[PDB]
Design a protein around this ligand. Structure first.
Ligand SMILES: CCCCCCCCCCCCCCCCCC(=O)OC[C@H](COP(=O)([O-])OCC(O)COP(=O)([O-])OC[C@@H](COC(=O)CCCCCCCCCCCCCCCCC)OC(=O)CCCCCCCCCCCCCCCCC)OC(=O)CCCCCCCCCCCCCCCCC
Ligand SMILES: CCCCCCCCCCCCCCCCCC(=O)OC[C@H](COP(=O)([O-])OCC(O)COP(=O)([O-])OC[C@@H](COC(=O)CCCCCCCCCCCCCCCCC)OC(=O)CCCCCCCCCCCCCCCCC)OC(=O)CCCCCCCCCCCCCCCCC
Ligand SMILES: CCCCCCCCCCCCCCCCCC(=O)OC[C@H](COP(=O)([O-])OCC(O)COP(=O)([O-])OC[C@@H](COC(=O)CCCCCCCCCCCCCCCCC)OC(=O)CCCCCCCCCCCCCCCCC)OC(=O)CCCCCCCCCCCCCCCCC
Ligand SMILES: CCCCCCCCCCCCCCCCC[C@@H](O)O[C@H](CO[C@H](O)CCCCCCCCCCCCCCC)COP(=O)(O)OCC[N+](C)(C)C
Ligand SMILES: CCCCCCCC/C=C/CCCCCCCC(=O)OC[C@H](COP(=O)(O)OCCN)OC(=O)CCCCCCC/C=C/CCCCCCCC
Ligand SMILES: CCCCCCCC/C=C\CCCCCCCC(=O)OC[C@H](COP(=O)(O)OCCN)OC(=O)CCCCCCC/C=C\CCCCCCCC
Ligand SMILES: CCCCCCCC/C=C\CCCCCCCC(=O)O[C@H](COC(=O)CCCCCCC/C=C/CCCCCCCC)COP(=O)(O)OCCN
Lengths: 156, 178, 459, 606, 128
């Protein structure tokens, strides 16, 4: 029962076309603003605010409670991106571009310190461990027909 | 949740909501009951300091400054009730909620069990079918020609009338349906 | 081979002589019997193929495809009879006739010894599919979908005909045995390059290759349920089978003629997996997942290793079964709510638990959970690609991650959350639908016990 | 025949019997959970015997009972490895699962799908056993994905809740990120060693290159939730408490550590991968311990404790001490399961409340739970001669006495401080002070199931360390000579953590209020890693998936080039050809033109 | 006074920090009333069908159909070949293909030239 003129069309340029488009999407003409008229193909569809579904009021009596949407209302172009199982735009206690500095600084500091500690390792004041039979030459792969160089250990 | 929202919030409503949010976040910060009570009375005093202001502009500026202070000093992990929209048990029992119209698709052998319940359900269905037309007529009568202005619904006004659009409000599955 | 072809032909007068209320029963029973008979072709000799006669032969590659087609016909009949209940007897018989003709053309296509007969049957498969899509499709876009499906195929297939007749003129034969035994290298020349392209592009567009895949979403979404089943399960595999048959004479040119196709296949499998993440139509997501799986099959065929062909055969069989099951699962909900939008009906697990179990198993097989044959084929192809180049693992892992992502996204969107309130016409699942899902899924799991049946000649 | 193989296979086989009976009548009754629990207990008491055989004679075996398929020179067979690792880990996992199912019989009593819950737990146990006992990489991958999928299904148990589905998908995403590296390792091993089985790989890889080891490290980081892929483990607390106690605490999350232990002969031949593992473990354990000390949800704190302990297992792998890592897994299982069990009892008593700010004085109201949690906290902090002592203190000793990265050592010590820090936080905020819960008291822990299960795990957490440490052969060279201050480093660190955390917790009684510091905001919000990494890459990926892949290419440009151009060209040519005015004058003029051309451009050329 | 919070794309501005909701004019109140009236009329239209005992089926939503049509069928009719569109299409279409061709061709050329030298250590590589 959705007739032909209830479907999205081309970009509106005349004020009467904009009024008709705003009425078609159940919006105020003062609120309805389409996407810029490039060749991206948005056409008549309104450019709703880029808020997520998580930011909507959870105490309202929505027609679809999980979706947080009302029947017949214009749906954001990127609804499936903002379904709140996904990308969230909700305001954070700490400003964006402030969390980024802290996170990047922490990771960079830890990486630089790990590299420094690799340059300056920790060890005990001991000599290398000593093994009896030419450093176990026959044990570590064998080849018992090539007379390994004598690895000789002395007591101290 | 149960009340139809208004077109906008008054300054008084915003002030009370900010008061409640500040109190809850202060309780989140002040874990213990005595310290929370002390700082809550301090908050109440600071809040009553500007109780009787008559200049709306300065009251609005005070509200904006208070909101900025709350946002800067809010708890990053405020306490949330388990069933609240942020709680750990918010939508836990939603998978147990089955709509009542599913009972019509039951096999007759399934309805052989529970006979009295289904007889009473038949009574309820007759009631709804016999009230629907009067509900629609009342809604048409009590509505301005330019459509409804708010989401409020009128009550019943006649002898044997039921409030319009009542079936899906009365027949909620449950809060703990299983 | 006549013991399979002749009963399939007999299916036609049998269904044209049946009573108005017995056509589905008779067709299903005898299609199942024909599938049982065709199951006997899996006994393969190893060294060489089974050469029944001059016209037909059976291979370790052809036999699983033949069994899959014969098994798919009864499932198509079971899925069709619900939405065709209001049809007249003559039109239902015509629909079943289209299905039987498609089966006959498919079973003859996979066994032809000579490439012109293979081409003739491989083009003949077009007509019944086109008639089904354009006559029993539901929406008004079925006409445009049919035009796309026909012309995309033919624009690739005609140069193949020219190349085949030229090759027979130059060599003297097109019989696959003579072709294989008298194979000579293709020199590095423009004439040989264009011969390679003419021999490859038809099978490329039937897979479909990324960039030539635009017909597939239209045709698979706009077709009735049986049409989508046969398009995804069997008709996509014609390109792969043709590639495996035809690349025998293309060496050593494939060594560098495959570079653009490998690049297109890898990046386009990434692209289609990403596309599946933002899809509002449930059938289009399944179609694009099919495109990604066939891109992986294209890579496997292009790299020309035994492990690659084994993985490609396993992946073809597994993808056919899984895609058919997924299309049937989507069709059940569409029949319930008469809309293909994914978010229209939500939380169906609360209302249909067994169908939710079928959905979960189909989604698990789509993401290639071990030790299912889907992962057997995918892992073999990935290992062969790693041998081809160690850098392919980045794209393979990205594709695996995105595949799991959209598979579970579809499952969560359709089955979980809370039900839509106003939708109140969701009846309990019928025995027919549950039986159809079980008949899709059980052979998949049973093939895990005997993976060598679908690994192909290189085994 | 030697009873060892038969008993080891029977232990695994009898666990599948309830899965086969899931379609029988017992699944429709209320006796199913008790039946599954009894089956698991019988499996544990049966698995006890091969452990005794190994502890006597060191018996190890591999069983290639069934041949699956052969591809050319490569043979794939159902093969089970029954070395020290399997015969030690199977009884511990069965014991923990037995206790946790007995707990679940009480905790999940009012759930209408308790039978499905127990079936899912049994399926997870079967898949984990397959993962642990696998002898080739394909079977281990089967167990890998089985436990991953079971975790997905159990996290989203309440599928009507959006956050549970989100957390399950997050876990799947991170596990597949690790699975990329797993598949890379499999492909490299097949291509270069012509085998997937463990024995051939060891023989043919004397000097293991970097590629397979980096693949295995990526897989382990994905499965064990290391710093790059950590956030899914804390978010896995969306599932019911028994799921967190069993899967995401002690049994499944150690799969990456176990995978690295399974390949230690190859790992000890490469120092770059060892350094990478050590550094990743150190950053993981300290970051998670830092995040833990500021959390208010008890399950989140215990999950961050689990992540920190996994990082400790990674660092002890990095210093070439795999047997010590396995010992740590076995020891940590007991008291971490007990800690989640105590937290779940507390949550159930206080009307499903998990915030410690509303948990008052339960030291007297819940005596048995308090005792069990105190014992588990002492075991976690390495109190001498407890379960945690015999492994954690040896790990600290070995880290101190090795040629190791200095930063990793320092971060390990700071994490050792933070462990006592958040343990003190949990105890102080949950058991001491005055009540802070709603007035209607429902506190009741007088149920035989809960008491018996917690008691069994308490006896384990008290004696298993000593018994297991004294009943295994020496596989690591002891550190006998070390400086006294360096011997006591772990205890000094633990006491410092105790004292300073207790001081800062005692200072909140004061009637003084101050705004939080930036370091506190960094710690509480998990370093802003979920705030940025869960929003920026996901948004960009989905936006490019829609705008570029779907719309720009398939719907616009691929349409423009092949089909739309053809349609436009043919329409224009048809309009040009067919639009004639029907006048014979023009036609015959064109005929004259054509004749003139044929006689000149063709008739002059012969 | 206190440090200020600045919004971004993925962390938007809170309502209480929005100066727009604290600078109110009668036309703003009229706009809010108009929006509320539109919402109420849509809610009434939906609820009259939701509570209908006679109605059986799915209540069609025009808005959902508009969204799906715009996202699927309305895109090409509103496409124009534009320098922005052309450049973005060319980049996102053929850039990655040539990038991956270069990477794979370089890797395989190195591997093949290293094979011809007799130095790859292909011992035990019998499966491909
Ligand atoms: C590993 C355990 C071994 C157990 C031994 C016995 C197993 C017999 C099972 C036979 C195959 C199952 C058939 C699938 C169709 C669904 C049936 C159904 O509708 O349920 C009705 C029935 C009636 O229940 P209801 O109360 O009326 O309501 C049900 C509701 O609809 C809702 O009920 P629900 O929510 O509980 O869903 C039903 C159930 C069923 O849904 C499923 O998804 C089950 C199927 C598993 C996934 C399938 C694709 C993944 C690829 C694996 C391919 C394996 C093939 C092996 C050969 C199979 C032979 C046919 O779903 C689940 O339980 C969760 C699925 C997670 C499975 C994870 C397993 C990963 C791999 C594990 C190892 C696989 C290889 C084994 C050897 C490894 C090396 C030693 O429910 C059941 O009986 C449950 C089925 C039992 C669960 C089986 C899970 C593992 C079995 C896998 C294959 C068996 C391998 C045997 C070899 C030896 C080992
Ligand atoms: C002879 C050798 C023996 C050595 C013995 C000891 C050696 C000295 C130890 C002293 C070191 C730390 C002492 C305690 C720290 C905090 C105490 C304090 O003052 O409290 C006030 C305050 C706490 O905040 P608040 O406003 O009071 O909390 C609001 C309410 O109270 C919120 O209340 P609530 O109800 O939410 O809960 C309160 C909760 C939450 O309280 C918090 O908010 C604190 C959270 C953070 C502080 C925790 C310290 C851990 C630091 C580890 C950092 C490792 C390096 C990371 C590098 C990051 C790079 C950006 O507190 C707790 O429950 C426990 C908190 C921690 C207790 C245990 C801490 C001891 C472990 C650390 C020392 C290790 C001892 C053994 C040494 C082992 C090796 C020798 O602390 C601060 O404002 C500053 C904290 C200092 C952290 C510095 C991080 C180190 C690296 C900085 C960057 C370096 C590079 C330069 C920049 C980059 C250039 C490019
Ligand atoms: C399988 C995977 C998927 C594959 C398929 C998908 C991807 C492929 C297919 C789809 C994408 C390809 C689309 C092709 C372009 C179609 C253009 C079109 O339809 O126009 C009709 C359309 C309608 O005509 P109209 O209504 O009569 O005109 C009114 C205009 O709207 C009024 O506009 P206006 O007056 O404001 O502006 C017009 C004016 C001013 O235009 C502008 O203001 C913007 C500048 C446009 C021209 C220069 C580009 C500037 C920015 C990038 C510069 C190059 C950067 C480096 C590139 C290589 C980097 C390594 O035009 C110019 O000045 C251009 C002069 C030419 C100078 C540069 C020539 C460079 C040729 C190509 C170089 C790159 C080769 C590829 C390298 C790849 C390496 C791996 O005209 C336009 O509106 C567009 C005009 C601008 C076209 C620029 C095209 C740039 C894209 C690359 C083209 C090369 C690819 C095609 C190969 C065959 C070329 C012979
Ligand atoms: C959307 C998806 C559609 C399907 C995609 C199909 C892909 C088809 C591409 C075919 C792959 C390559 C074709 C031929 C291989 C090499 C091509 C050429 O560039 O290589 C050089 C060839 O040199 C020059 O480049 C000649 C070619 C230049 C003219 C071709 C125009 C290319 C412009 C791109 C047009 C787009 C084509 C596809 C339209 C859709 C090699 O130098 P040389 O060793 O000396 O010549 C070897 C040949 N010999 C032995 C006979 C001498
Ligand atoms: C190596 C190949 C892979 C490398 C990683 C490439 C980037 C991966 C991009 C994946 C994009 C997938 C997007 C589709 C998912 C759908 C949307 C979605 O998932 O929502 C985000 C969802 C909800 O967020 P919450 O905060 O939990 O919400 C709770 C309260 N509401 O959470 C998620 O699942 C997001 C997960 C994004 C992961 C991306 C970051 C991973 C980066 C890994 C790099 C580190 C490597 C490890 C190094 C190990 C050392 C060797
Ligand atoms: C249960 C009721 C039956 C109890 C009575 C039976 C008593 C003992 C009878 C023993 C059966 C006789 C027998 O073992 O003959 C060998 C007979 C066939 O020979 P094989 O080479 O070993 O396998 C076929 C491929 N070569 O072996 C068998 O099939 C029986 C034993 C099989 C064990 C069960 C399989 C377990 C794994 C299930 C499938 C998992 C998917 C594959 C994973 C691959 C992992 C790398
Ligand atoms: C729906 C989309 C699918 C599009 C697929 C179209 C590509 C098909 C491949 C090219 C088709 C023509 C191939 C011709 C048949 C091959 C026979 C042959 O090898 O003969 C060659 C003849 O080679 C040619 O003539 C080829 C010239 C090309 C004619 C038509 C050109 C049309 C465009 C060609 C490029 C596009 C093909 C690939 C594009 C794929 C789709 C984008 C040599 O014969 P001789 O003359 O005897 O030489 C040796 C003795 N001197």
């Amino acid at each position: 029962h959705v007739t032909k003129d209830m479907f999205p069309g081309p970009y509106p340029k005349t004020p009467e076309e904009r009024a008709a488009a705003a009425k078609k999407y159940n919006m105020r003409v003062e609120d309805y603003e389409p996407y810029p008229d490039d060749g991206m193909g948005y056409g008549d569809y309104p450019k709703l605010p880029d808020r997520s579904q998580q930011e909507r009021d959870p105490w309202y009596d929505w027609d679809h409670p999980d979706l947080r949407l009302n029947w017949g209302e214009p749906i954001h172009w990127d609804l499936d991106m903002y379904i709140r199982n996904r990308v969230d735009t909700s305001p954070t206690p700490v400003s964006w571009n402030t969390m980024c500095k802290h996170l990047f600084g922490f990771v960079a500091f830890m990486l630089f310190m790990f590299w420094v500690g690799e340059i300056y390792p920790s060890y005990q004041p001991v000599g290398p461990k000593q093994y009896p039979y030419n450093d176990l030459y026959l044990e570590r792969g064998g080849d018992p027909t090539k007379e390994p160089e004598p690895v000789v250990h002395y007591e101290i | 949740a149960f009340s139809a929202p208004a077109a906008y919030l008054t300054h008084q409503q915003k002030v009370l909501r900010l008061y409640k949010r500040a109190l809850r976040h202060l309780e989140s910060w002040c874990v213990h009951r005595d310290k929370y009570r002390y700082f809550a009375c301090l908050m109440r005093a600071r809040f009553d300091e500007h109780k009787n202001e008559k200049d709306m502009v300065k009251a609005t500026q005070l509200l904006r400054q208070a909101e900025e202070e709350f946002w800067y000093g809010q708890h990053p992990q405020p306490y949330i009730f388990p069933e609240s929209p942020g709680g750990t048990s918010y939508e836990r029992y939603e998978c147990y909620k089955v709509p009542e119209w599913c009972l019509d698709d039951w096999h007759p052998s399934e309805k052989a069990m529970y006979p009295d319940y289904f007889a009473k359900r038949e009574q309820w269905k007759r009631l709804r079918r016999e009230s629907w037309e009067r509900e629609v007529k009342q809604l048409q009568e009590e509505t301005p020609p330019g459509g409804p202005r708010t989401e409020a619904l009128p009550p019943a006004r006649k002898e044997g009338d039921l409030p319009p659009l009542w079936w899906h409000i009365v027949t909620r599955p449950r809060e703990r349906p299983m | 081979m006549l013991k399979i072809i002749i009963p399939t032909t007999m299916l036609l007068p049998m269904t044209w002589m049946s009573k108005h209320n017995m056509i589905w029963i008779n067709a299903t029973v005898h299609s199942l019997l024909i599938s049982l008979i065709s199951l006997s072709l899996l006994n393969q000799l190893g060294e060489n193929s089974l050469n029944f006669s001059l016209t037909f032969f059976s291979d370790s590659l052809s036999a699983p495809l033949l069994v899959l087609t014969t098994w798919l016909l009864p499932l198509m009949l079971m899925a069709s009879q619900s939405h065709l209940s209001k049809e007249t007897t003559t039109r239902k018989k015509l629909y079943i006739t289209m299905l039987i003709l498609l089966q006959l053309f498919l079973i003859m296509t996979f066994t032809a010894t000579e490439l012109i007969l293979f081409y003739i049957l491989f083009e003949a498969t077009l007509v019944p599919t086109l008639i089904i899509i354009t006559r029993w499709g539901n929406q008004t876009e079925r006409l445009n979908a049919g035009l796309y499906f026909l012309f995309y195929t033919l624009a690739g297939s005609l140069p193949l005909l020219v190349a085949l007749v030229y090759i027979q003129n130059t060599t003297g034969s097109l019989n696959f045995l003579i072709i294989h035994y008298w194979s000579h290298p293709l020199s590095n020349s423009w004439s040989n390059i264009f011969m390679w392209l003419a021999c490859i592009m038809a099978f490329m567009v039937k897979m479909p290759l990324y960039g030539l895949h635009l017909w597939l979403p239209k045709a698979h979404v706009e077709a009735p349920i049986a049409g989508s089943m046969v398009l995804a399960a069997v008709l996509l595999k014609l390109g792969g089978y043709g590639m495996m048959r035809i690349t025998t004479i293309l060496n050593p040119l494939t060594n560098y003629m495959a570079y653009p196709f490998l690049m297109l296949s890898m990046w386009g499998m990434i692209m289609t997996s990403s596309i599946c993440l933002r899809q509002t139509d449930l059938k289009s997501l399944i179609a694009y997942s099919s495109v990604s799986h066939m891109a992986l099959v294209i890579v496997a065929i292009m790299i020309q290793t035994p492990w690659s062909f084994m993985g490609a055969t396993a992946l073809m069989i597994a993808h056919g079964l899984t895609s058919s099951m997924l299309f049937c699962l989507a069709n059940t909900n569409y029949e319930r709510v008469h809309s293909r939008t994914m978010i229209l009906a939500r939380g169906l697990q609360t209302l249909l638990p067994l169908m939710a179990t079928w959905w979960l198993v189909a989604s698990l097989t789509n993401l290639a959970l071990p030790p299912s044959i889907n992962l057997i084929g995918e892992l073999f192809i990935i290992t062969a690609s790693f041998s081809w180049s160690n850098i392919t693992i980045i794209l393979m892992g990205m594709n695996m991650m995105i595949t799991a992502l959209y598979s579970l996204y579809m499952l969560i969107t359709t089955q979980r959350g809370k039900y839509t309130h106003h939708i109140n016409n969701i009846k309990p699942s019928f025995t027919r639908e549950n039986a159809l899902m079980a008949l899709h899924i059980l052979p998949l799991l049973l093939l895990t016990l005997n993976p060598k049946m679908i690994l192909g000649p290189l085994y | 025949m030697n009873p060892f193989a038969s008993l080891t296979l029977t232990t695994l086989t009898i666990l599948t019997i309830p899965i086969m009976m899931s379609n029988s009548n017992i699944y429709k009754t209320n006796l199913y959970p008790n039946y599954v629990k009894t089956t698991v207990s019988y499996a544990f008491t049966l698995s006890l015997v091969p452990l005794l055989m190994f502890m006597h004679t060191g018996q190890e075996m591999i069983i290639s009972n069934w041949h699956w398929m052969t591809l050319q020179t490569v043979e794939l067979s159902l093969s089970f490895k029954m070395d020290y690792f399997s015969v030690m880990f199977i009884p511990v996992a069965l014991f923990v699962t037995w206790s946790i199912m007995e707990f679940s019989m009480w905790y999940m009593h009012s759930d209408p799908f308790i039978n499905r819950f127990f079936k899912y737990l049994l399926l997870f146990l079967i898949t984990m056993m397959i993962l642990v006992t696998a002898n080739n990489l394909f079977q281990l991958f089967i167990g890998w994905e089985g436990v991953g999928i079971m975790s997905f299904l159990l996290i989203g148990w309440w599928h009507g809740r959006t956050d549970a589905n989100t957390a399950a998908l997050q876990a799947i995403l991170y596990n597949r990120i690790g699975d990329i590296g797993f598949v890379l390792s499999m492909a490299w091993f097949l291509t270069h060693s012509n085998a997937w089985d463990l024995q051939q790989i060891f023989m043919l890889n004397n000097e293991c290159p970097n590629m397979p080891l980096i693949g295995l490290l990526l897989a382990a980081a994905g499965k064990s939730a290391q710093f790059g892929l950590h956030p899914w483990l804390p978010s896995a607390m969306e599932g019911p408490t028994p799921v967190s106690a069993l899967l995401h605490s002690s049994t499944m999350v150690v799969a990456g550590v176990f995978l690295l232990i399974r390949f230690y002969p190859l790992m000890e031949t490469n120092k770059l991968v060892q350094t990478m593992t050590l550094c990743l473990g150190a950053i993981t354990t300290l970051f998670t311990a830092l995040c833990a000390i500021t959390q208010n949800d008890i399950k989140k704190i215990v999950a961050f404790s689990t992540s920190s302990q996994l990082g400790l297992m990674m660092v002890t792998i990095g210093i070439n001490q795999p047997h010590l890592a396995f010992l740590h897994i076995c020891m940590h299982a007991f008291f971490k399961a007990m800690l989640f069990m105590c937290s779940g009892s507390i949550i159930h008593s206080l009307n499903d409340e998990q915030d410690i700010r509303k948990m008052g004085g339960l030291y007297k109201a819940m005596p048995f739970t308090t005792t069990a949690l105190i014992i588990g906290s002492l075991a976690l902090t390495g109190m001498p001669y407890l379960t945690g002592f015999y492994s954690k203190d040896l790990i600290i000793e070995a880290v101190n006495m090795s040629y190791t990265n200095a930063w990793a050592l320092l971060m390990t010590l700071i994490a050792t401080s933070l462990t006592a820090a958040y343990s003190t936080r949990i105890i102080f905020f949950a058991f001491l002070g005055k009540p802070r819960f709603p007035p209607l008291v429902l506190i009741n822990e007088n149920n035989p199931l809960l008491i018996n299960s917690i008691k069994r795990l308490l006896i384990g957490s008290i004696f298993a360390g000593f018994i297991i440490s004294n009943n295994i052969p020496p596989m690591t060279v002891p550190n006998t000579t070390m400086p006294l201050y360096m011997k006591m480093t772990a205890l000094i660190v633990t006491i410092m953590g105790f004292m300073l955390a207790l001081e800062l917790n005692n200072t909140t009684y004061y009637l003084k209020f101050k705004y939080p510091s930036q370091t506190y905001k960094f710690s509480n919000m998990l370093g802003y890693y979920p705030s940025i990494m869960h929003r920026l890459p996901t948004y960009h990926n989905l936006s490019m998936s829609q705008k570029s892949a779907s719309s720009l290419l398939d719907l616009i440009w691929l349409e423009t080039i092949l089909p739309k151009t053809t349609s436009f060209i043919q329409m224009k040519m048809s309009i040009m050809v067919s639009n004639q005015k029907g006048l014979i004058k023009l036609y015959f003029l064109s005929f004259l033109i054509t004749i003139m051309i044929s006689m000149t451009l063709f008739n002059y050329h012969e | 006074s206190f440090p200020k919070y600045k919004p971004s794309r993925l962390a938007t501005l809170p309502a209480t920090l929005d100066p727009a909701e604290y600078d109110i004019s009668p036309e703003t109140r009229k706009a809010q009333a108009e929006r509320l009236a539109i919402r109420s009329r849509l809610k009434r239209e939906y609820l009259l069908q939701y509570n209908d005992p006679n109605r059986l089926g799915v209540i069609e939503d025009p808005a959902l159909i508009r969204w799906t049509y715009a996202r699927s069928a309305n895109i090409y009719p509103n496409f124009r070949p534009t320098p922005k569109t052309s450049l973005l299409g060319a980049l996102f279409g053929i850039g990655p293909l040539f990038f991956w061709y270069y990477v794979f061709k370089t890797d395989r050329d190195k591997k093949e030239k290293l094979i011809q030298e007799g130095k790859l250590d292909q011992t035990f590589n019998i499966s491909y």
